[PDB]
Amino acid sequence: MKYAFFLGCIMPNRYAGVEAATRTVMEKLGVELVDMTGASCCPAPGVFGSFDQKTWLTLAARNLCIAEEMGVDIVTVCNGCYGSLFEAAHLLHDNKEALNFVNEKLDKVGKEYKGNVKVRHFAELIYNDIGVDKIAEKVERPLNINVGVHYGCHFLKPTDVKHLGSAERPVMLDEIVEATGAKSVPYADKMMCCGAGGGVRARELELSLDMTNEKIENMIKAGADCTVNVCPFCHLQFDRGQIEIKEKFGKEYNFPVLHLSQLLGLAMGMDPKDLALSVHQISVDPLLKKI
Amino acid sequence: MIYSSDLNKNLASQIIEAGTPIPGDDVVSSLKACYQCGTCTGSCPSGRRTSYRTRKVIRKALLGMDDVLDSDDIWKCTTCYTCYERCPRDVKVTEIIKTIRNLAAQKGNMAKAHKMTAMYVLKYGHAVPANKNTAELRKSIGLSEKAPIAQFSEKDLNEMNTLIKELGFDELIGFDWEKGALKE
Amino acid sequence: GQKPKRIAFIQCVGSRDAKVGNKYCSNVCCMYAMKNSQLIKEKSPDTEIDIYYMDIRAFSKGYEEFYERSAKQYGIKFMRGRPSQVIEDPETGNLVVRAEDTLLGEILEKEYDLVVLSVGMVPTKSADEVQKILGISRTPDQFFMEAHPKLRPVDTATDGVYLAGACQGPKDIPASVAQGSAAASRA
Amino acid sequence: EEPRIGVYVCHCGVNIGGTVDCPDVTEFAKTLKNVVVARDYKYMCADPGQEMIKKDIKEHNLNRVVVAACSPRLHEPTFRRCVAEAGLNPFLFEFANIREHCSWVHMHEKEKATEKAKDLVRMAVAKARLLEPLEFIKVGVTQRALVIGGGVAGIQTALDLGDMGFETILVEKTPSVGGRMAQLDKTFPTNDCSICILAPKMVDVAKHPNVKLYAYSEVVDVQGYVGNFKVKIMKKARYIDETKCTGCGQCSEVCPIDVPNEFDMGIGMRKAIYKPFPQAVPAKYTIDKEHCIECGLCAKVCGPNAIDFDQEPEIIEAEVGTIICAIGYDAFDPTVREEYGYGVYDNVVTALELERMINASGPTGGKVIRLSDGQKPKRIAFIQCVGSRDAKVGNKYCSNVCCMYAMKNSQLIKEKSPDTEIDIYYMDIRAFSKGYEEFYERSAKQYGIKFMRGRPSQVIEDPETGNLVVRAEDTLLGEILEKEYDLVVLSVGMVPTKSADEVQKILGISRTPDQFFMEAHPKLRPVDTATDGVYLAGACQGPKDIPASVAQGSAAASRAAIPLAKGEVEVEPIIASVDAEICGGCGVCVKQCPYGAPRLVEKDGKVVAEVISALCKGCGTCPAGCPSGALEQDHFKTIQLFKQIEGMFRDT
Amino acid sequence: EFANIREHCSWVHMHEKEKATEKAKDLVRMAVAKARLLEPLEFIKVGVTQRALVIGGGVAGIQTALDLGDMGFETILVEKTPSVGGRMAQLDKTFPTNDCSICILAPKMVDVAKHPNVKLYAYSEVVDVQGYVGNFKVKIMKKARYIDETKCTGCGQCSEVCPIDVPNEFDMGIGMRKAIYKPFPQA
Amino acid sequence: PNPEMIAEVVKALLEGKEPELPKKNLCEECARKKSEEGVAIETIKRNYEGNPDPEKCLLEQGYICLGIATREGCGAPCPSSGVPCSGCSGPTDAVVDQGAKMISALCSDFGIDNDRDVDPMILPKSIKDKIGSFYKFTLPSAFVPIRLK
Amino acid sequence: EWEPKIIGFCCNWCTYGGADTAGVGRMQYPPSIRIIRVMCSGRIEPSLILKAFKEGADGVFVGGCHLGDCHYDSGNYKWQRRVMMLYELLEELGIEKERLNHEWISASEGEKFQNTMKDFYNKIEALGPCKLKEELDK
Numbered sequence A: 001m002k003y004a005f006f007l008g009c010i011m012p013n014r015y016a017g018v019e020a021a022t023r024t025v026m027e028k029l030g031v032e033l034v035d036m037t038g039a040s041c042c043p044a045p046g047v048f049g050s051f052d053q054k055t056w057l058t059l060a061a062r063n064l065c066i067a068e069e070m071g072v073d074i075v076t077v078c079n080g081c082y083g084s085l086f087e088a089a090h091l092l093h094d095n096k097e098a099l100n101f102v103n104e105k106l107d108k109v110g111k112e113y114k115g116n117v118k119v120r121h122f123a124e125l126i127y128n129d130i131g132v133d134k135i136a137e138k139v140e141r142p143l144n145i146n147v148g149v150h151y152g153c154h155f156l157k158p159t160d161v162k163h164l165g166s167a168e169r170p171v172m173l174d175e176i177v178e179a180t181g182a183k184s185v186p187y188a189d190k191m192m193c194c195g196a197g198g199g200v201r202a203r204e205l206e207l208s209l210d211m212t213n214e215k216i217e218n219m220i221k222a223g224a225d226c227t228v229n230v231c232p233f234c235h236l237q238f239d240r241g242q243i244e245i246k247e248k249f250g251k252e253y254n255f256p257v258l259h260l261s262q263l264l265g266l267a268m269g270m271d272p273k274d275l276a277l278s279v280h281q282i283s284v285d286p287l288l289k290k291i
Numbered sequence B: 001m002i003y004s005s006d007l008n009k010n011l012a013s014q015i016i017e018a019g020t021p022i023p024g025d026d027v028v029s030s031l032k033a034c035y036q037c038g039t040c041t042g043s044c045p046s047g048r049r050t051s052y053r054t055r056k057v058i059r060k061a062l063l064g065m066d067d068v069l070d071s072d073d074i075w076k077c078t079t080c081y082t083c084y085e086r087c088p089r090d091v092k093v094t095e096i097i098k099t100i101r102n103l104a105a106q107k108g109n110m111a112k113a114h115k116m117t118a119m120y121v122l123k124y125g126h127a128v129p130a131n132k133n134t135a136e137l138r139k140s141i142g143l144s145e146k147a148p149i150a151q152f153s154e155k156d157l158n159e160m161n162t163l164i165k166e167l168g169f170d171e172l173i174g175f176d177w178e179k180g181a182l183k184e
Numbered sequence C: 001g002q003k004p005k006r007i008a009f010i011q012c013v014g015s016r017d018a019k020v021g022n023k024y025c026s027n028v029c030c031m032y033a034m035k036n037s038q039l040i041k042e043k044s045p046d047t048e049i050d051i052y053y054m055d056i057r058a059f060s061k062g063y064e065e066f067y068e069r070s071a072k073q074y075g076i077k078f079m080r081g082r083p084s085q086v087i088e089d090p091e092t093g094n095l096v097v098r099a100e101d102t103l104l105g106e107i108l109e110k111e112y113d114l115v116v117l118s119v120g121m122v123p124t125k126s127a128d129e130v131q132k133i134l135g136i137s138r139t140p141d142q143f144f145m146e147a148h149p150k151l152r153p154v155d156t157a158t159d160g161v162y163l164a165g166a167c168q169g170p171k172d173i174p175a176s177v178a179q180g181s182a183a184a185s186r187a
Numbered sequence D: 001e002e003p004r005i006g007v008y009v010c011h012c013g014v015n016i017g018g019t020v021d022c023p024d025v026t027e028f029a030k031t032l033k034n035v036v037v038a039r040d041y042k043y044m045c046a047d048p049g050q051e052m053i054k055k056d057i058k059e060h061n062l063n064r065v066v067v068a069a070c071s072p073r074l075h076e077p078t079f080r081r082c083v084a085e086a087g088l089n090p091f092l093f094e095f096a097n098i099r100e101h102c103s104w105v106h107m108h109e110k111e112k113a114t115e116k117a118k119d120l121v122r123m124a125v126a127k128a129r130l131l132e133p134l135e136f137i138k139v140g141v142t143q144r145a146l147v148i149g150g151g152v153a154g155i156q157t158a159l160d161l162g163d164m165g166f167e168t169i170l171v172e173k174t175p176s177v178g179g180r181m182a183q184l185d186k187t188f189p190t191n192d193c194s195i196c197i198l199a200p201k202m203v204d205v206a207k208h209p210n211v212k213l214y215a216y217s218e219v220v221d222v223q224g225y226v227g228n229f230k231v232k233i234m235k236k237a238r239y240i241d242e243t244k245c246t247g248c249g250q251c252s253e254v255c256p257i258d259v260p261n262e263f264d265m266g267i268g269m270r271k272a273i274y275k276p277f278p279q280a281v282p283a284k285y286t287i288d289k290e291h292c293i294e295c296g297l298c299a300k301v302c303g304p305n306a307i308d309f310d311q312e313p314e315i316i317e318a319e320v321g322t323i324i325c326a327i328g329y330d331a332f333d334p335t336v337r338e339e340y341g342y343g344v345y346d347n348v349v350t351a352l353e354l355e356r357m358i359n360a361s362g363p364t365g366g367k368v369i370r371l372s373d374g375q376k377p378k379r380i381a382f383i384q385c386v387g388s389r390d391a392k393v394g395n396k397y398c399s400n401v402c403c404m405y406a407m408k409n410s411q412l413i414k415e416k417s418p419d420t421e422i423d424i425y426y427m428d429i430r431a432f433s434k435g436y437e438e439f440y441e442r443s444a445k446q447y448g449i450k451f452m453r454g455r456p457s458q459v460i461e462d463p464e465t466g467n468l469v470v471r472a473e474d475t476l477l478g479e480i481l482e483k484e485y486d487l488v489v490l491s492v493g494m495v496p497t498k499s500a501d502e503v504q505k506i507l508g509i510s511r512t513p514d515q516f517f518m519e520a521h522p523k524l525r526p527v528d529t530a531t532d533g534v535y536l537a538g539a540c541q542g543p544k545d546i547p548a549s550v551a552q553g554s555a556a557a558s559r560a561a562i563p564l565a566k567g568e569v570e571v572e573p574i575i576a577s578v579d580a581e582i583c584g585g586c587g588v589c590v591k592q593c594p595y596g597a598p599r600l601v602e603k604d605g606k607v608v609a610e611v612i613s614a615l616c617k618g619c620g621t622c623p624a625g626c627p628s629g630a631l632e633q634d635h636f637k638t639i640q641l642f643k644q645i646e647g648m649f650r651d652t
Numbered sequence E: 001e002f003a004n005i006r007e008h009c010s011w012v013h014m015h016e017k018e019k020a021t022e023k024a025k026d027l028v029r030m031a032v033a034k035a036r037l038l039e040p041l042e043f044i045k046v047g048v049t050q051r052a053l054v055i056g057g058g059v060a061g062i063q064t065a066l067d068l069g070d071m072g073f074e075t076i077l078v079e080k081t082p083s084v085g086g087r088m089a090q091l092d093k094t095f096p097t098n099d100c101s102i103c104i105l106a107p108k109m110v111d112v113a114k115h116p117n118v119k120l121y122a123y124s125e126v127v128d129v130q131g132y133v134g135n136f137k138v139k140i141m142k143k144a145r146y147i148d149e150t151k152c153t154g155c156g157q158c159s160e161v162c163p164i165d166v167p168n169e170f171d172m173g174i175g176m177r178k179a180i181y182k183p184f185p186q187a
Numbered sequence F: 001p002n003p004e005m006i007a008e009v010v011k012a013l014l015e016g017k018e019p020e021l022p023k024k025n026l027c028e029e030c031a032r033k034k035s036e037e038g039v040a041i042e043t044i045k046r047n048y049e050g051n052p053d054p055e056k057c058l059l060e061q062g063y064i065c066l067g068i069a070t071r072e073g074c075g076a077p078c079p080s081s082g083v084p085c086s087g088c089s090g091p092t093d094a095v096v097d098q099g100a101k102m103i104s105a106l107c108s109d110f111g112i113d114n115d116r117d118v119d120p121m122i123l124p125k126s127i128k129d130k131i132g133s134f135y136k137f138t139l140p141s142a143f144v145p146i147r148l149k
Numbered sequence G: 001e002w003e004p005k006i007i008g009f010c011c012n013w014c015t016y017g018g019a020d021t022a023g024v025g026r027m028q029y030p031p032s033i034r035i036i037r038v039m040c041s042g043r044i045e046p047s048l049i050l051k052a053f054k055e056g057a058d059g060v061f062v063g064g065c066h067l068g069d070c071h072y073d074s075g076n077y078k079w080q081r082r083v084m085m086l087y088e089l090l091e092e093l094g095i096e097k098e099r100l101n102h103e104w105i106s107a108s109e110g111e112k113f114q115n116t117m118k119d120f121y122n123k124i125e126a127l128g129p130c131k132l133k134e135e136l137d138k
């Protein structure tokens, strides 16, 4: 499998350990990740989609064009970037008026989207094209710990275009984390939002933290040792938000946060130093002792 | 007391035009199918800790209450798509909120942090750009010091600046190219 | 003699109202109000139409679909709130509808060029004479009384005397046509 | 004879005239060959317009009339009668749709719509010239009716027809008649027992001298046409001798195998040998061979020696003139609305399950109890519009009865347990008929039933207690509610019955967008179907209550009695026929007809095809497939259609 | 002998069970008391005149007479106003199909007017009904139009001269007709 | 045209009589046996595929035989000789476009015994030369008598 | 300066009703098409479509009942086998496959008809005029 690896913003420029973790994990599964040179912000639909829809799609198509020129499909480890580029691609295929508008703008930079790009979220790529069986075959260090699985919202929703099954009762991530020897603990309002999306983290911080706190409390009550997400935005909200909850409300949890690639990396015997858990706001050391 | 003079009758149509052709005429015209059932509000995680009521946004849009564009409430939606998934009338709620926010942005109702985010993508092609600590972390992790992204590619940064100017996004956020910063 | 640019339909006028003695639903008013709103929009798309209602009763085949259509296709607006009063501007002839938008918990005072009252159904004036000639009874709604609401919907307690249509109770055309056919079978 | 045509252009007030330049179309019409008269008029279907054609037919000795106006689907019969009254054969008349198909869809392109109208008139005139005079076919009507479905609707049709003196056959799928009404405890708005109205009717129908009831039977084949249907009924094996059976049920006490009772919606347990419900008609027992172990214990207690395991199903051949479809409906399955948790949470039930729970003769002995612990619920929530008015499940229609049965069962629960708190989560309360609004007023003022305007978002079960929480917005307060309940009732909508697919294929009827059967015309032919001699009655035609279903049953009996009373009906002659001088018997046409009308035969020593006129419905498939051109559908001949195609571009 | 203990007892004494039970006992005793002296009576078999009477010429009445006439039964249709059609004839279009009301009703009005088994009496009223099921004797008053029915062309040139303006009932009091008139064009 | 037909036509004209051509299609003259139940085509074969039965109609055997859409008079020498009719006599008087009617007939009966489920793409995928299969002798008289370039 | 000439063939039970419903609903669509009414789409055969191109059709449209909903049970199944061969025959004759359009539209589906007419008109307008009649008139 050959895929243009879209990086986004937060993973390559903040939680870089997620990038390193993905590169090796995907190489171990037999996926050739080729550099999508010059790729920009997806752009984040929370700000751009909310500010100007035409700007969101045009810039997203510009990124889609990079992979199209490369003659390959895209893979991403961020729900935000997945949602942004996937919804953009679907719209350019289903809506000709939108495609015509965008290509009239892309002509000014010498580009033209032709609809051959498929956008994939690495978790569903692992689930539908590689297989969960392959994850277990590569497990060097079984992670026998409880995980509070956070699917995020832009992963399976909107279902009408994603077609990744149920958004109410999914198994996809649970089966992928359980393949590392872990246990996906069932918790209250599991499919609820972390609170960071749609520009809420930036404009309405306390409101975002209230939702994140509810999710952490529910996971801790379910007996989770940590939380696993598939979204650098969810990652930042759960990680950096725990400091904010402490600084504002006064509630402390020290609940380890991991991105699925980091969890799969540990499982595949990677050095925790290479996963960059040190740059996390909440120490992952308590979880590292449990594994 | 809401009088006809306090209402903007064309607000629904105005939201639809802002959504044509992206996300689409059929998508945003779906607000006209709303029968005020409340399923969207009941499904809203944000609505459980605030005064935000998803159904009222759509009601205000149909009634013509312009203040919805000046409201902080429309900005409390996280785009979780739950309402979008459960609406029995096929209203594309999440997309309508985003399109209403477009009209809000045009009126000047944009948070400074959001404009900053937009300015970072305009200036460095990225919402969360690389700093000195990024280079040092990436180096110690075994990754290329600078990711193969638009931030370090002038060709790509210039391409984006051309599209941004053509889309008028720079004027929308109030960015001055000469000064290299935002206004107000 | 001028064409109205703004129109308000007031639902349940003379129905579901104890003050006028009609505590029943007239069955067809929600539908004909939405229908005529569509016809006005086809003839004049720029016309703004608001329907003041309590419940939209689009209960039969294609009715809910017709209701969905009025709003999505024709842009007919609906306000859930039974109006309190209508006030005329003696200078223009324009009317103001006072009502609470119950779905917002706020009072509206919108101006209109024409107000349409969705009047209910009542027995025809001659019903009194026809009752005395046939020897049939009336139900609380003043319409003619059927032998049994379910065991015999078109028969009357008077043998050889049957009913068909709106004289038996408020109903639409197909329901009336069905009763006409039913009465023919029973008779 | 040379065509003499009269072209009439309608303005339809301004519906046509406002977009199409009708006077200009009329002028253009006169430039076409054979057009002797051409006139434009405000309303052609009005008395003046019809008299104008009738007068011109006589005064200008016309033999073809073309009406350029609305759709033949609306006024073809009107103009057919109009010309026939003047002596012109109705099949020498041709309709040109310049309203629905032109003026109403090209309002902002008047010039092009006028040009299009001219071409449509020319296309019509082109076909008109080659039209031929045709005569309707007269067929006899077998004095017998067939009612499929033994619910309140079908029973009503069978009773009225039998009371009129017509031999009627009533086929019922399950072992007893009564339908879903039999499953209800009480019925709104009178709060009568379902049995009050239904049982006497079941009794009457079973012993009616003009009605032959075939319970536990299914129609497996229907062939023929109006007045001449040949039907096959499969009398399924009960494995008990009905004439010998007493219906005492000593056998039910002895049977050791337990089967979930379908009548109780899986909330009851029946035996292999059973009677659907205590008031079942025929009051006879049935053996489910799918679960019977053949121990023969039931046979030891049966006095009349009725049990016979060697019973074989009997195929009955019957001839009927008319058929009434009254197969009813099925309750929507709410498992799909995953947020409400039906099939996951024990205390979430459908209203039909509740009916069986609240019915005295039900599995719980008329006691409303939680299926998780058997305890009576102190707090109940009804969720309206479940499986209706919802695009996500594909049911964008109102199921009509859910608002009323929810309020009725709430009244019933309050009478049995006044301390029970009941909340109804709704969008619109549809209490639209006689005494309904009054029933709604009563539920709140007399019984204290509460109403919440808010379609719930989700139901959440407490795994430890089994209690449910309903998440919904009280839209009348602009606040989110999260009330706890002991039992949640889902007011499930109506969907077509499972067998509807099999019945549709057997009768050759269509379905409306809601998947229920399609009536000929909503407003004027509410119980007829486009298929002559086939009618509908009850819920299979669309969601409705008992008052309406009984009325439809009576209506269907009237409509179905018209051909029977006349004893003769006519059929359209737009049928296929073979030109024997051209047919060389290639055999391509035979298998194309789904009614088997085209058949190969020996004529004057050679093989040629011959259509059995009565079996042809007039589709035009086999003439279209005929490679010799010997087969033609009158009124849609290849040459007639060829000229129509030429007409769009030039005059023929 | 019937003893009514539901509508007359259990349904009206729900909160007084002991007294309802006592009342039911007395009603049973009252019935038993009359039952003892009841006598066997022979139901009177009476013939049925093969003719039906439909009062009201709207879509419901028209449907009943058409079905009955189509079944071969002599039917009489009495209509109060000068024309059949009812309120449906006053409508413009009909929901949920938005069909033209008169455009689909006129063919049925025509069918009824020329039906070989239906005798239409327009501008007439039933003034007396005597008898019982199967043997009704009915009196129909064929109101005077004051215009020769047979010599009436229906052109409408005598109305111009009339100096008396009467509000048109068909137009709900908006329009103005003359003493000499016609209800509607498709009448 | 057969020599006898030429003589018949010329003779009639010399006598002053109007010449009349045969009207039926070829199966009348063909000596091959047809199924009483009607024609049903399961598969389509090119003339070299398989070994054809000498008694059964070649069209029911899967070969594109134009006899069904071809005027009689020749005596059907081709099917009698073991090869399908190529439609050399042209269409009957009631058929303008022979090829179009032949395609209609062929598509109609293809998989008629499995009418509702048969794949409608088997036939176009199987016939690799449609014009040459249905317009050998009549392309110029067809509704579309040329190929657009 | 040029407007497509499109001919249509619609069955009386569904598409003809679908087309009427678009009109009842005032669903505007381009005025290129001219519809011919047949009782069933099963009546439609190759010669009717080829005759239309001969006459100068830029586009040919055919509308019948949804597969399984034919008023005559299986008339449309025959037409479906006929149209698939016809698409390929047209390519062999140099006529773009796109110039032929067949759809399944029920009587209630007025919006689908409106959109099918809109989409087909745009398709043919983009292809330009079919130059068959001009080639034959030489």
Ligand SMILES: Cc1cc2nc3c(=O)[nH]c(=O)nc-3n(C[C@H](O)[C@H](O)[C@H](O)COP(=O)(O)OP(=O)(O)OC[C@H]3O[C@@H](n4cnc5c(N)ncnc54)[C@H](O)[C@@H]3O)c2cc1C
Pocket: D148, D149, D150, D151, D152, D153, D154, D171, D172, D173, D174, D176, D177, D178, D179, D180, D181, D184, D186, D187, D188, D189, D217, D218, D219, D326, D327, D328, D329, D330, D331, D351, D352, D355, D401, D404, D405, D408, D497, D499, D500, D503, D537, D538, D539, D540, D544, D545, D546, D547, D549
């Ligand atoms: C929970 C609930 C509560 C309700 N409460 C009320 C109420 O209080 N009052 C009210 O008026 N209405 C009520 N209704 C509506 C009411 O159920 C219907 O109006 C009524 O059952 C209509 O009867 P039917 O004859 O039309 O169809 P059905 O009752 O469904 O009867 C259909 C009959 O046909 C038979 N059948 C099916 N397929 C075949 C076949 N292939 N061959 C032969 N026979 C076949 C069936 O076995 C059945 O006997 C309620 C509905 C529900 C779901």
Ligand SMILES: Cc1cc2nc3c(=O)[nH]c(=O)nc-3n(C[C@H](O)[C@H](O)[C@H](O)COP(=O)(O)OP(=O)(O)OC[C@H]3O[C@@H](n4cnc5c(N)ncnc54)[C@H](O)[C@@H]3O)c2cc1C
Pocket: C028, C032, C035, C124, C126, C127, C130, C164, C165, C166, C167, C171, C172, C173, C174, C176, E055, E056, E057, E058, E059, E060, E061, E078, E079, E080, E081, E083, E084, E085, E086, E087, E088, E091, E093, E094, E095, E096, E124, E125, E126
């Ligand atoms: C504003 C409005 C809009 C509506 N729109 C629609 C719609 O869009 N679609 C729809 O389906 N339904 C509609 N309805 C309902 C519809 O009007 C009725 O269903 C219909 O009129 C009922 O027909 P009917 O024959 O039962 O009664 P009517 O139509 O009123 O006919 C009764 C007839 O009997 C005659 N008559 C009266 N008294 C006597 C007497 N003593 N002797 C002899 N004859 C007598 C009358 O003159 C009249 O001709 C509407 C109703 C209203 C008020």
Ligand code: SF4
Pocket: B033, B034, B035, B036, B037, B038, B039, B040, B041, B054, B055, B058, B083, B086, B087, B088, B089, B090, B091, B093
């Ligand atoms: S869920 Fe849909 S119909 Fe209901 S209030 Fe929200 S947008 Fe309107």
Ligand code: SF4
Pocket: B040, B043, B044, B045, B046, B047, B054, B076, B077, B078, B079, B080, B081, B082, B083, B084, B093, B094, B097
């Ligand atoms: S998408 Fe927005 S409005 Fe809708 S439920 Fe989520 S946060 Fe609420």
Ligand code: SF4
Pocket: C011, C012, C013, C015, C016, C024, C025, C026, C027, C028, C029, C030, C031, C055, C056, C057, C118, C120, D432
């Ligand atoms: S049908 Fe509608 S407007 Fe009429 S009485 Fe009922 S709720 Fe009121």
Ligand code: SF4
Pocket: D010, D011, D012, D013, D016, D042, D043, D044, D045, D046, D069, D070, D071, D075, D099, E100, E103
């Ligand atoms: S003939 Fe048709 S188009 Fe003309 S007035 Fe009558 S309904 Fe209208």
Ligand code: SF4
Pocket: D240, D244, D245, D246, D247, D248, D249, D250, D251, D252, D284, D285, D298, D301, D302, D303, D304, D306, D307
């Ligand atoms: S024991 Fe025999 S007679 Fe009695 S109910 Fe059972 S089968 Fe019938």
Ligand code: SF4
Pocket: D254, D255, D256, D257, D271, D272, D273, D287, D291, D292, D293, D294, D295, D296, D297, D298, D299
């Ligand atoms: S033989 Fe069959 S019916 Fe009789 S008791 Fe046994 S299982 Fe039951």
Ligand code: SF4
Pocket: C059, D384, D385, D386, D388, D389, D397, D398, D399, D400, D401, D402, D403, D404, D428, D429, D430, D491, D493
């Ligand atoms: S009758 Fe009531 S509960 Fe049922 S679908 Fe209609 S609005 Fe909903």
Ligand code: SF4
Pocket: D578, D582, D583, D584, D585, D586, D587, D588, D589, D590, D598, D608, D609, D625, D626, D627, D628, D629, D630, D631, F025
């Ligand atoms: S398809 Fe035509 S030529 Fe062949 S047998 Fe039938 S009628 Fe005769």
Ligand code: SF4
Pocket: D575, D576, D592, D593, D594, D595, D596, D597, D598, D611, D615, D616, D617, D618, D619, D620, D621, D622, D623, D633, G072
């Ligand atoms: S035209 Fe249709 S219904 Fe008539 S015989 Fe041929 S295939 Fe059968």
Ligand code: SF4
Pocket: E147, E151, E152, E153, E154, E155, E156, E157, E158, E159
């Ligand atoms: S002038 Fe008046 S009264 Fe005389 S025939 Fe004409 S309409 Fe009748």
Ligand code: SF4
Pocket: D586, F026, F027, F028, F030, F031, F032, F034, F056, F057, F058, F059, F060, F065, F066, F067, F068, F076, F079, F084, F085
């Ligand atoms: S082989 Fe050809 S000519 Fe002979 S019967 Fe068959 S199709 Fe007809």
Ligand code: SF4
Pocket: F067, F070, F071, F074, F075, F076, F077, F078, F079, F084, F085, F086, F087, F088, F089, F090
């Ligand atoms: S190819 Fe010619 S000679 Fe041979 S059978 Fe056919 S028409 Fe006759």
Ligand code: FES
Pocket: G011, G012, G013, G014, G015, G039, G040, G041, G042, G064, G065, G066, G070, G071, G072, G073, G074, G075, G076
């Ligand atoms: S009737 Fe529409 S396709 Fe056969």
Ligand SMILES: [Fe+3]
Pocket: D045, D046, D075, E103
């Ligand atoms: Fe008309």
